[PDB]
Design an enzyme around this catalytic site. Structure first.
Site, PDB file in Angstrom:
ATOM      1  N   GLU A 125      10.396  72.128  92.244  1.00 24.71           N
ATOM      2  CA  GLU A 125       9.050  71.643  91.975  1.00 24.71           C
ATOM      3  C   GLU A 125       8.096  71.948  93.128  1.00 24.71           C
ATOM      4  O   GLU A 125       6.890  72.112  92.915  1.00 24.71           O
ATOM      5  CB  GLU A 125       9.058  70.171  91.555  1.00 24.71           C
ATOM      6  CG  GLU A 125      10.018  69.878  90.409  1.00 24.71           C
ATOM      7  CD  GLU A 125       9.725  70.621  89.112  1.00 24.71           C
ATOM      8  OE1 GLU A 125      10.411  70.340  88.105  1.00 24.71           O
ATOM      9  OE2 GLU A 125       8.835  71.496  89.090  1.00 24.71           O
ATOM     10  N   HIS A 166       7.245  75.479  92.428  1.00 22.03           N
ATOM     11  CA  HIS A 166       6.261  75.516  91.335  1.00 22.03           C
ATOM     12  C   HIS A 166       4.860  75.073  91.739  1.00 22.03           C
ATOM     13  O   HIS A 166       3.858  75.661  91.288  1.00 22.03           O
ATOM     14  CB  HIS A 166       6.758  74.737  90.134  1.00 22.03           C
ATOM     15  CG  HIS A 166       8.042  75.264  89.583  1.00 22.03           C
ATOM     16  ND1 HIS A 166       8.712  74.612  88.593  1.00 22.03           N
ATOM     17  CD2 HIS A 166       8.738  76.370  89.949  1.00 22.03           C
ATOM     18  CE1 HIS A 166       9.800  75.325  88.372  1.00 22.03           C
ATOM     19  NE2 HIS A 166       9.857  76.401  89.173  1.00 22.03           N
ATOM     20  N   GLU A 208       9.353  68.201  80.053  1.00 23.01           N
ATOM     21  CA  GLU A 208       9.835  69.558  80.221  1.00 23.01           C
ATOM     22  C   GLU A 208      10.472  70.144  78.962  1.00 23.01           C
ATOM     23  O   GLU A 208      10.092  71.237  78.519  1.00 23.01           O
ATOM     24  CB  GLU A 208      10.790  69.642  81.433  1.00 23.01           C
ATOM     25  CG  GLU A 208      10.090  69.371  82.779  1.00 23.01           C
ATOM     26  CD  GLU A 208      11.058  69.289  83.965  1.00 23.01           C
ATOM     27  OE1 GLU A 208      12.091  68.589  83.871  1.00 23.01           O
ATOM     28  OE2 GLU A 208      10.774  69.905  85.014  1.00 23.01           O
TER      29      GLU A 208
HETATM   30 FE   LIG Z   1       8.360  72.783  87.535  1.00 23.22          FE
HETATM   31 FE   LIG Z   2      10.403  71.623  86.271  1.00 19.25          FE
END
Ligand SMILES: [Fe+3]
Ligand SMILES: [Fe+3]
Ligand SMILES: [Fe+3]
Ligand SMILES: [Fe+3]
Ligand SMILES: [Xe]
Ligand SMILES: [Xe]
Ligand SMILES: [Xe]
Ligand SMILES: [Xe]
Ligand SMILES: [Xe]
Ligand SMILES: [Xe]
Lengths: 512, 162, 384, 512, 384
Positions: free
Chosen positions: A130, A133, A195
């Site tokens: 994350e 990301h 998700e």
């Molecule tokens: Fe992510």
């Molecule tokens: Fe994720």
């Protein structure tokens, strides 16, 4: 020379002993409130060690940044994208950025919750993913600001996002919903629903629409992000597996799941449909079709079905969700456009071909939305000299716009072709406006969890230009607005154009 | 006036600047929490500025507390002189003795209004969040959808304006 | 087949026709509004600062209003209430190494692949032949192996911090501090797994070193300190500061640098030092960030310096005693070494190096009056 | 913890002591014959060590391979290129590949020649760079083979190039010219002339033509190769500096330079212009202008001028090179096309727009070449059922084609718009054919350096199809030729189509 | 401005229209005609094999005819005449590690960047503090420093082979073997440069170690052997074989692994081993390629096995004598060590490790009858 075969040790060979790393002590327990017990001994799917995790991600980064820095830049890919999409990506990348960001904290919480070392390890990799990301989404905006046709908004969304109403709802699903509550409820919001139901399909769909609209920057980054998502799905599945053999699961799991499902769909149903259909020139597929496949079939059916053996069942609110869906995104764009001066992006009225596309795919669209947009254009909504903001039309036609106290999604009951439900309560000297029976129950049962001040409460009695000014909603010339009611290169609205309209916010609930 | 700076925020940092003892600062902070925070607040007049004002009041209490207390007390006593561990335990015990979700929410919400750092040390307070939240949820989330909305509205006590 | 707008004649022509003549704003620098720490804004900063959606009521936040959904009871998603430390701006922190995700995994990946080649070389080179068997069998397997649990506990101590950190810059630094710790725990096991492959009869099972950690005497107080730092501390800053600026800076540094790194070489062991090199490289990297956050930003905060230093001195005292206890029990390990390995003179000098380094690098930064002799004497008390 | 600031050591700090690495011993001397003496205190411009060199290049590689594997592949960049350019790259990348390859050995020879450790080090960086370049050119052919419109030839040029006459000349300038002779003559062919005059500007030019023709693969690779070239020109410059203060320089340098200049230009003047103008659809710039700028201005003027202080003068053969240049590429394409069955690539006759372009930039082009191309097309040169190969037209019109014994460049003196020189000598039972005064002197003075058998000598008395079959000039079906007289996807020539023509090679010199 | 054919509507339309229906050949595999060494053709092989334009008259060449330009006198560009070894095909060799330029520089870059971080960590950690000053100032500075010249000479021995190698696969391996040697020489200097920065008064100038190499007793025969291997050998194969499968395999392995890597740890020196780890990793990588070329391809050639083994045994005898003399003189270094550093029993054991390793990995592959005791005794004669 020498003697002995070259030998080494891999991730699996070390991971084999990782479960044994945790040891027993009286206070070895989670620091977070939870109704559940995550079984120690819970295992993880991916046998990773920190070094191998870094290596697998580094190779991906190499490819990604290579494409961005060399060929795509040489191709001027940051420029040759449809104006509408350049704007959509300001919202798509920065809003997704906050979900990536809060997901770091969410998985830190889940890592804390898990007692089995392997389960903690699974959440840990997601913690690192994350962060990756967050930086990737940040990079998409960085790239478009550095090399695109309109950097404003792409360059300061972290602060300009705060002016508008759509951001509040994004914080509910991808920030607070991910970290505030029982760790398991957060996991349901994040992994099992967020998700698995929305992000995973959305990320790939975004690359589809991007490509259609000339954007090759987004596919390069988002396709790299999607390669990590499989491990996150596993984490979500593992959350359920870890708590399933405890008595609390039978009592609480399905209501936390239902609440999380409603929470996520309440925002994404209208918002993503809006971003796709109204933020693009070239269309890939009507949202009604997409939503049904993603939520009702793929997730609601197949994905959730794989969790039936752990006592998970289809959200009781699924039917309601499908019913409210059809017109949701159309209803919302009317408000997003009407409130265009509060954004950090430029919006356009649908052109002739789009109106035809909309009507073909949504019979009755033109009679309602089409006619309204035509009226707004006639009133001069695109022209700086008109002295017209669509919000003025809402006032003239007695169409109050409310903000759901729970989801933060704006809604206009008297106009909407969708839901049209409104619940207004007064409690201890304050009024609250709800748009559905699920969020209403959430507030009634947990009023202290939902006290978010809305745009109309905060901006109450303030003149619009002063809000935009204080919140830095201007371009570098210090006068032209970042947001615009059209995507053309000139006739851009300025702060003074807004000031002359003398739009002063009112809290709509005060009418009661 | 503005979102991040305005007359009311100004009025409050001036009043906060006048506090000169840990007890008066802690009292003002506690009174502030009863008056302006949670759905049970005495007034909604400061809805747009209380979050920030509270933080400013907290700074004053914190600074005065660090000067006043010896090291052990800074770790184990609340700003009002109570033994944190005793308060933690007694509050959790009351929560665990709660007979329904209504009594339960009052205990948790009230605990926050009265002991939120810098009143109670953070270590004890978050341990309280861990224990109190667990029981509150166990009680609230049981048969969560059984009560019809018409009845739940009455249980909560809202005046339905619609 | 799919038609892409960048290359399809029809779609590209439509796109090109819609483009303005020049960019709609000349300011092409993303986080241009961020106050740079250095001469010019860096990539690390642009991609990181303000990613956290804090409102103005959490020092330094640019947003406004309450969170949209809070915990049952009312606790905020992130709030000032999660730590005793106060500051004018939580976004002040900067990792001096400027590590965002990309450079962090880049470096770790280089270390991983080089580790693989090194082991492939070491085994092919037959360098194990001159390693002392007693050192390998008792000291590396049991005692160094036991240390894996120390690092693992220190790793786990970061879990709450990953959730509660009040800014993006602090969260990123914190996550990397924790990830490096689990890496080190895994590298200790990796070495044991390697020995199991090249040395017949060597058992890679963690059973022995785990039993040493959970029930032995040498690591008794160490384990007690770790269990405490991890599970008895609910303040994310207390955890980070106490782990990195007290416990690991004293105990960890002694064990890694002054015992294993210093002594393994006397037993023909260049294997363990290969991995300790990584551990020490990681310790020194985190240190820079720990110092920036706790000293440069918090301890030197323009409005809360005095307050913060009081709290940090408090935590130092709180954790210094169990840290000394940890070092004291560890002194017991020297008695188990083959006769002639070391002497009290070398042990004493090594203790002073660790204490002196800790005083200059940490203690002195917050005006904590540490007495070097007093500390060394207390530790020496446990020699046998 | 710490006590002392973090410190390290960089390439330059280590390089400071590199010159001292070499030590004195009686036999510390070059193993290669040379007329010159490279000064043992010669320094190098780039202060590099092996580790830093590797890092510099690794960064470049990740960018390049990232582009190729990610964005370019997603964009189907290997396919969306003009057919003619796909073919041109089979030749451009493979022919350049052998240049990079032999350059590795050339710099090895130079590293052995240099007596100063620093000078050796500079040559060494180039040894590694040329290895990098070999794999890079190889990768371009590999990528077009894997992903392009016509893999044949791209997939086996290392063996199919041996069938044709253009390959022989390529080996003279970029293989043997780089490694056979006095190390200094080799350095002049490689660095002072080859890279400084031709390759450096050529690599960049290739990316412009490639980009115009839809090829984004070559730019990605060749632009990366270009980043290393300045180090090599520094090597060439250093070669001159190292030998300039010794008596041998005044006696021999300008002769070796003149010989190297003529050698390189003899091949590149006609070949490059041919590959660019006839190998493309879209044109970047007429070769006449390019050649003049590269050779006369940039190199012969500026670049060479910088070496004046070391006794270097513009090659005495420059004016002759300009004289013969004008029509050189046009004259050669007639021959390459006439001999199309001997290649490993597909050639096209100029289309109508190109014919107009050719006449516009080269007045007189149409009445000579235009007429010939039109006649050949009329005779069915593109049609497999015609029974016509242009070689037949040459035989019918009494225009013998010869191969220069020295440069290997094919020439047709009786038809040529450019040079018509033809010198034929008999020596010890064998005849030799020359196309210019410079190469004739080279052979007369050094006959043993120039004994290369030409295609007419090797293929004498052999039927065409037998030669193509033996040397694997077929596609995977084992029937269709790799080479073609058109670039269309249909009516491809077959081995039987060639066999039916019964074309049997004759050594042209036997007519004397 | 610049319109590109892939993105320009008008230009792309023209290109698209000229494109064929499907590819004109389904064989999309470059290098498909190369005989794979392993299961399937590798990228390494595809990008390398047959890049060298040899004609059929140099074993395995696919081209025909003479070179286009030869040396004055007539020497061919490349020819059979440049080496005594003969083969059925010079293209048979494959580097078992499959390295073409990309992976080779990728790995070395990782080592460079990790080296930098290690040094930053070591200096920050104060690890020099426990390093013996005599070992540091005498042994690392002068004696290890002097070894840089040995590796530099060995690197230089490769120049002619870079020019004369008869195939692409052998040329690439050969260059990498040489490039690693110069890298090692630079790493020895890098260490001396680091020491000069962290140790007051330490002189990084090469004058001292250079004088030790050019005038001392310890490295005399080593230097003599290096000078010969480099400048007196004109056969590229004799050079590579005798450097890697005789001299460096015996003398180099002894000095790096049995002296410095074995003893540096006894003086609190983990710094030198960090670099020796690189040298040994490099040595073992090179060994696999050296073994494939000289044994798998040449020594086991289906037509020239017996011939090539006779020549390689001839070279082994030729170079074993000066190699033994190198080791013999080097034994003199033991007497310069502080009393009690090592003993004859350890030295003898280390010599046997090197010799036995050499017999197993190299000597036995060509049926060269080495007498381990004769060799060790011959070397020990320079000790006492
Ligand atoms: Fe992510
Ligand atoms: Fe994720
Ligand atoms: Fe090159
Ligand atoms: Fe070059
Ligand atoms: Xe979004
Ligand atoms: Xe939009
Ligand atoms: Xe608005
Ligand atoms: Xe070429
Ligand atoms: Xe070319
Ligand atoms: Xe061509």
């Amino acid at each position: 020379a020498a003697n002995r075969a070259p030998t080494s040790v891999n991730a699996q060979e070390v991971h084999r002993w990782l479960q044994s790393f945790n040891w027993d002590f009286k206070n070895n327990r989670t620091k977070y409130a939870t109704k559940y017990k995550m079984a120690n001994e819970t295992k993880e799917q991916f046998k990773l060690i920190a070094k191998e995790y870094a290596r697998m991600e580094a190779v991906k980064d190499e490819r990604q940044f290579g494409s961005l820095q060399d060929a795509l830049t040489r191709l001027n890919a940051g420029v040759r994208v449809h104006p509408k999409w350049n704007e959509t990506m300001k919202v798509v990348s920065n809003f997704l950025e906050v979900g990536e960001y809060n997901a770091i904290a969410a998985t830190g919480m889940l890592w804390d919750s898990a007692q089995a070392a392997e389960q903690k390890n699974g959440y840990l990799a997601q913690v690192l993913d994350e962060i990756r990301h967050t930086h990737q989404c940040a990079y998409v905006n960085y790239y478009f600001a550095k090399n695109g046709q309109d950097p404003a908004g792409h360059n300061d969304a972290r602060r300009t996002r705060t002016i508008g109403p759509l951001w509040k709802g994004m914080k509910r699903v991808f920030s607070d919903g991910f970290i505030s509550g029982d760790a398991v409820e957060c996991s349901l919001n994040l992994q099992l629903v967020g998700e698995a139901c929305f992000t995973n399909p959305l990320i790939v769909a975004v690359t589809e629409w991007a490509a259609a609209n000339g954007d090759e920057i987004t596919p390069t980054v988002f396709l790299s992000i999607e390669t990590d998502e499989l491990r996150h799905m596993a984490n979500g599945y593992q959350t359920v597996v870890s708590i399933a053999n405890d008595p609390a699961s039978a009592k609480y799991l399905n209501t936390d799941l239902n609440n999380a499902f409603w929470t996520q769909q309440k925002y994404f149903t209208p918002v993503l449909g809006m971003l796709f259909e109204y933020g693009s020139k070239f269309k890939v597929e009507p949202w009604v079709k997409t939503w049904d496949r993603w939520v009702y079939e793929d997730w609601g059916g197949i994905w959730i079905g794989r969790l039936g053996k752990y006592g998970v069942e289809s959200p009781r609110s699924l039917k309601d969700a499908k019913q409210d869906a059809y017109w949701a995104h159309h209803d919302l764009y009317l408000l997003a456009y009407a409130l265009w001066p509060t954004g950090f992006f430029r919006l356009a009225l649908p052109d002739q071909e789009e109106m035809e596309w909309f009507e073909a795919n949504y019979p009755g669209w033109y009679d309602h939305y089409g006619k309204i947009y035509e009226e707004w254009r006639a009133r001069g909504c695109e022209d700086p000299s008109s002295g017209f903001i669509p919000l003025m039309w809402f006032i003239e036609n007695n169409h109050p716009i409310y903000i759901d106290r729970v989801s933060q999604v704006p809604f206009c009951p008297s106009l909407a072709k969708g839901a049209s439900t409104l619940r207004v309560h007064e409690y201890n000297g304050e009024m609250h406006t709800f748009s559905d029976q699920w969020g209403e129950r959430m507030w009634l049962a947990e009023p202290e969890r939902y006290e978010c001040q809305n745009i109309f409460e905060q901006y109450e009695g303030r003149e619009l230009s002063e809000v935009i000014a204080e919140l830095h909603g201007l371009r570098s010339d210090g006068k032209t607005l970042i947001a615009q009611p059209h995507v053309r290169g000139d006739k851009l609205w300025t702060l003074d154009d807004i000031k002359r309209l003398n739009c002063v916010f009112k809290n709509p609930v005060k009418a009661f | 006036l503005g979102i991040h700076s305005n007359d009311t925020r100004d009025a409050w940092v001036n009043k906060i600047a006048q506090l000169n003892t840990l007890e008066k600062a802690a009292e003002m902070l506690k009174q502030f929490r009863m008056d302006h925070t949670t759905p049970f607040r005495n007034s909604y007049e400061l809805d747009n500025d209380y979050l920030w004002i509270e933080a400013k009041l907290e700074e004053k209490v914190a600074v005065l507390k660090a000067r006043a207390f010896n090291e052990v007390d800074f770790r184990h006593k609340t700003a009002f002189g109570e033994d944190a561990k005793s308060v933690l335990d007694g509050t959790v015990a009351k929560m665990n003795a709660a007979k329904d979700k209504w009594e339960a929410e009052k205990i948790h919400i009230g605990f926050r209004q009265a002991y939120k750092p810098p009143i109670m040390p953070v270590n004890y307070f978050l341990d309280g969040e861990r224990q109190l939240g667990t029981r509150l949820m166990e009680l609230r989330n049981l048969n969560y959808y059984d009560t019809p909305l018409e009845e739940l509205r009455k249980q909560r006590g809202v005046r339905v304006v619609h | 087949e799919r038609r892409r707008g960048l290359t399809d004649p029809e779609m590209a022509a439509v796109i090109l026709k819609a483009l303005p003549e020049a960019p709609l704003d000349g300011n092409n620098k993303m986080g241009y509004f961020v106050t740079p720490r250095w001469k010019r804004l860096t990539e690390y900063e642009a991609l990181t600062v303000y990613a956290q959606p804090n409102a103005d009521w959490i020092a330094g936040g640019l947003d406004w209003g309450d969170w949209t959904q809070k915990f049952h009871g009312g606790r905020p998603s992130w709030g000032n209430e999660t730590t005793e430390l106060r500051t004018v701006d939580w976004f002040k922190h900067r990792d001096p190494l400027r590590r965002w995700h990309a450079p962090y995994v880049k470096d770790k990946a280089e270390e991983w692949r080089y580790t693989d080649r090194f082991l492939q070389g070491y085994s092919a080179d037959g360098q194990i032949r001159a390693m002392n068997p007693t050192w390998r069998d008792e000291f590396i397997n049991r005692y160094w192996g036991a240390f894996l649990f120390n690092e693992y506990g220190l790793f786990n101590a970061h879990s709450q911090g990953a959730r509660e950190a009040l800014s993006d810059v602090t969260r990123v630094s914190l996550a990397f501090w924790g990830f490096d710790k689990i890496d080190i725990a895994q590298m200790i096991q990796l070495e044991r797994g390697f020995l199991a492959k090249i040395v017949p009869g060597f058992d890679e099972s963690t059973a022995v070193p785990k039993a040493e950690w959970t029930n032995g005497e040498v690591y008794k107080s160490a384990r007690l300190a770790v269990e405490g730092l991890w599970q008895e501390v609910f303040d994310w800053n207390e955890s980070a500061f106490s782990v990195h600026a007290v416990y690991d800076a004293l105990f960890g540094q002694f064990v890694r640098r002054e015992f294993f790194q210093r002594l393994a070489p006397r037993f023909g062991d260049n294997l363990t030092p290969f991995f300790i090199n990584q551990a020490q490289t990681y310790f020194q990297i985190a240190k820079q960030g720990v110092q920036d956050l706790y000293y440069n930003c918090l301890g030197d905060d323009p409005e809360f310096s005095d307050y913060n230093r009081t709290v940090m001195r408090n935590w130092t005292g709180k954790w210094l005693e169990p840290t000394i206890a940890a070092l004291r029990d560890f002194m017991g390990l020297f008695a188990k070494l083959p006769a002639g390995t070391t002497d009290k003179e070398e042990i004493t000098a090594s203790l002073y190096r660790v204490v002196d380094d800790w005083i200059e690098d940490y203690a002195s930064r917050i005006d904590f009056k540490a007495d070097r002799d007093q500390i060394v004497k207390a530790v020496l008390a446990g020699l046998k």
